[PDB]
Design a protein around this ligand. Structure first.
Ligand code: 8XQ
Ligand code: NA
Ligand code: NI
Ligand code: NI
Length: 292
């Protein structure tokens, strides 16, 4: 009943010196930590998160077309069937295109409309590519400030090589959200670790399960007729608990970085208005086992 709601591994850094440390690396890459939330790091490093505000993205690339997902707004622990009588696994999104500027108008308007003193659909801008140094140099330069183990460029500190860009397409991704925006359940591609920073002002609610349980999750997807690997799905928490699977549940506030270990099954819902930025940091999970 309480081994199933485990505490989420969490670090608060009072000093930047502790970010540039193999001790922090080892804490994060410990495979017993499906994720780790690092607080105070954006602050300590004085990262200009304003460079990732929607206003800034519109100024730089408002005319660019991006993918948008349309979803029924539901509480994070719910996913109803057509008849509104039962919970289900499949997580339906329609996929469409709009411009960054158009998404930004919707994001800002919906926020403005929420300010009154105390079904529905929402739209989520996904897979916004910030990889091109020709368009996004200031943003990428800010990301170069992170410790080498969390850095997009690893131990490198350059964005060009002999006059050519070096990052491939879709290396750095941004997600523009409103409350209800869901990232359905998945493991990170290629068994790489990744990092995710919330720009705010709103929060993201996260759910995670240790890799060890992935096959049981896949079996649930099978029973509900959705592909584990390629399909869109949202776990029914009661099913997980009834199978004795611990679920990590936490909130990622503005400035918090989430380290995601390889194989961790996770899913996320915005509870506020926010953007998130994310990139992979290579196959670092359990690397310390090399030293033993
Ligand atoms: O929506 C997000 O912030 C998000 C969080 C964590 C992830 O692993 C993602 N993967 C792909 C697309 C989005 C996300
Ligand atoms: Na309005
Ligand atoms: Ni794309
Ligand atoms: Ni992901």
């Amino acid at each position: 009943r309480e081994k199933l709601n485990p505490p989420t591994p969490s670090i608060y850094l009072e000093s930047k010196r502790d970010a540039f440390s193999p001790v922090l690396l080892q804490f994060c890459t410990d495979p017993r930590n499906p994720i780790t939330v690092i607080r105070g790091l954006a602050g300590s490093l004085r990262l200009n998160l304003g460079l990732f505000s929607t206003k800034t993205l519109v100024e730089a690339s408002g005319e660019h077309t991006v993918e948008v997902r349309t979803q029924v707004q539901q509480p994070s622990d719910e996913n109803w069937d057509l008849t509104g009588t039962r919970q289900i696994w499949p997580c339906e999104s329609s996929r469409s295109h709009t411009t960054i500027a158009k998404y930004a108008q919707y994001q800002a308007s919906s926020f403005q409309e929420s300010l009154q003193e105390e079904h529905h659909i929402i739209k989520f801008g996904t897979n916004i590519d910030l990889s091109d140094a020709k368009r996004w140099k200031p943003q990428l330069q800010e990301l170069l400030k992170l410790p080498a183990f969390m850095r997009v460029t690893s131990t490198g500190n350059m964005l060009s090589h002999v006059g050519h860009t070096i990052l491939g397409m879709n290396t750095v991704q941004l997600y523009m959200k409103v409350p209800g925006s869901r990232t359905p359940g998945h493991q990170e591609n290629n068994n790489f670790c990744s990092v995710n920073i919330n720009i705010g002002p709103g929060d993201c609610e996260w759910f995670a399960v240790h890799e060890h349980y992935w096959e049981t999750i896949s079996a649930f997807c099978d029973r509900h007729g959705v592909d584990y690997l390629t399909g869109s799905w949202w776990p029914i928490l009661d099913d997980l608990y009834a199978s004795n699977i611990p679920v990590y549940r936490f909130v990622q506030r503005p400035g918090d970085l989430v380290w995601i270990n390889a194989g961790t099954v996770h899913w996320v819902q915005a509870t506020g208005w926010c953007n998130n930025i994310a990139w992979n940091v290579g196959p670092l999970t359990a690397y310390q086992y090399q030293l033993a």
